[PDB]
Structure formats: C-alpha cells, structure tokens
Amino acid sequence: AGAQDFVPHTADLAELAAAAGECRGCGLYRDATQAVFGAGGRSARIMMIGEQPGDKEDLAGLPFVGPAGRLLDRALEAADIDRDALYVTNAVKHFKFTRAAGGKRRIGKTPSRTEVVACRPWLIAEMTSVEPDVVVLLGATAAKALLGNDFRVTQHRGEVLHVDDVPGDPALVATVHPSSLLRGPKEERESAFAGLVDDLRVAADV
Numbered sequence: 001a002g003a004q005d006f007v008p009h010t011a012d013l014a015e016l017a018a019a020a021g022e023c024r025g026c027g028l029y030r031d032a033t034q035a036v037f038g039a040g041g042r043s044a045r046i047m048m049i050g051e052q053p054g055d056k057e058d059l060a061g062l063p064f065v066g067p068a069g070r071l072l073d074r075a076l077e078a079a080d081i082d083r084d085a086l087y088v089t090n091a092v093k094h095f096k097f098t099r100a101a102g103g104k105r106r107i108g109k110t111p112s113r114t115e116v117v118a119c120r121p122w123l124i125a126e127m128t129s130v131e132p133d134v135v136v137l138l139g140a141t142a143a144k145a146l147l148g149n150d151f152r153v154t155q156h157r158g159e160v161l162h163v164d165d166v167p168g169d170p171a172l173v174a175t176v177h178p179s180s181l182l183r184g185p186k187e188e189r190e191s192a193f194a195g196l197v198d199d200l201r202v203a204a205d206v
C-alpha cells in the first residue's frame with residue numbers, strides 16, 4: 001500500500017504537497033527535514049521526474065535547486081524549453097541520506113525499489129493532476145518507476161516511448177540524470193550534456 005492512504009482524493013497540487021508533508025508511506029520521512037513535492041503548475045505540458053531531493057532541496061522545499069538543477073537549467077535553456085511549461089518532481093519525495101564523517105554535504109543514497117513503489121502513488125496523483133503530454137525521466141530510478149526495474153536508460157535514451165499502464169498515455173523520454181554531467185572526463189560530460197539537450201528537444205516536440 002505504501003503512500004496510498006496518505007494521498008487525498010484531490011488533483012490540487014498545494015493540497016497534494018501539504019498531504020505529502022504528513023506521509024508515512026515508507027521510512028524516509030523520519031530523517032528528512034520535510035517532503036519535497038514538485039514545482040510548477042497543472043497547465044504544464046512537460047513533466048520531469050528525477051530520483052529524489054538532495055541536501056539543498058531537503059532544506060529548500062523545492063526540487064533541483066542545487067548543482068544538478070543548475071546543469072538541468074543550462075540544458076533546458078539550450079533546448080529552448082522555459083520552466084513555465086514544466087512540472088518538475090522526483091520518484092521519492094523524502095531525502096534518503098548518510099553522513100560521511102569528514103565529508104562536505106549529506107550524501108544521497110539510492111532509493112530501493114520498495115521506496116519508489118511506496119512513493120509512486122504521489123507521482124500517479126501528480127500525472128493525473130498535470131495531465132502531461134510528455135514525461136521526461138531523468139535517470140535510472142525515475143525510468144524504472146514507470147518502465148520497470150529491468151529498463152536500461154543507456155539502451156533507450158532519446159526514444160519516444162508509450163506504455164499502456166501509465167495514466168493518460170503520455171509520451172515518455174528517458175535520459176541521463178543531470179548529476180552524471182558533473183562527474184567524469186570533460187568530453188564524456190560534454191557529449192552527455194549534448195545528449196540531454198537532444199533528449200529534451202525530442203520531448204519538447206512531442
């Protein structure tokens with residue numbers, strides 16, 4: 001059941017966000033500061049789904065406000081997408097993290113399939129409320145939530161996909177997680193930014 005009994009019967013994003021603040025669908029609400037719901041409105045045509053809020057998002061109350069969000073904005077700017085058409089959210093709404101003794105920043109830990117399934121009711125409520133025409137799936141965790149734990153982003157990135165079990169049959173475009181463009185060789189990162197831009201353009205023209 002997970003978060004099912006915490007999701008209210010409303011398509012109002014402010015009421016959904018307030019309700020996600022009391023959610024006990026899985027254990028992640030305990031160590032996290034607050035629930036991080038999605039930003040943007042119901043007029044949005046493009047829904048973007050990341051994995052989970054990070055350290056800044058957990059204290060800011062908004063998705064993608066740290067370094068990966070800065071990189072995503074640079075790629076949206078280059079793909080000619082304004083955020084006025086964007087509902088931006090994550091698969092899990094509570095920061096899963098550990099503290100590295102002698103490190104800078106709380107380090108994010110990969111949500112389990114159990115926690116992604118527990119949180120999925122909020123993503124179904126968001127998609128039912130926004131009725132997007134295209135869902136951009138940022139990374140493996142988000143793509144698996146809608147396409148199955150077998151899905152590989154590396155084998156299908158930039159492809160317009162359509163699965164029947166998803167609300168409203170929106171077009172789906174799976175791409176690299178923006179944090180991947182902050183790690184590695186300068187040319188792998190430049191090719192990967194160029195692929196995120198291409199994947200965002202495919203989604204913008206659906």
Ligand SMILES: O=c1cc[nH]c(=O)[nH]1
Pocket residue numbers: 050051052053054057062063064065066068069090
């Ligand atoms: O909102 C955010 C921030 C960082 N990484 C994500 O997956 N989502």
Ligand code: SF4
Pocket residue numbers: 002003020023024025026027028029035092093094115118119122
């Ligand atoms: S991560 Fe999702 S399911 Fe788990 S407590 Fe937070 S809102 Fe509820």
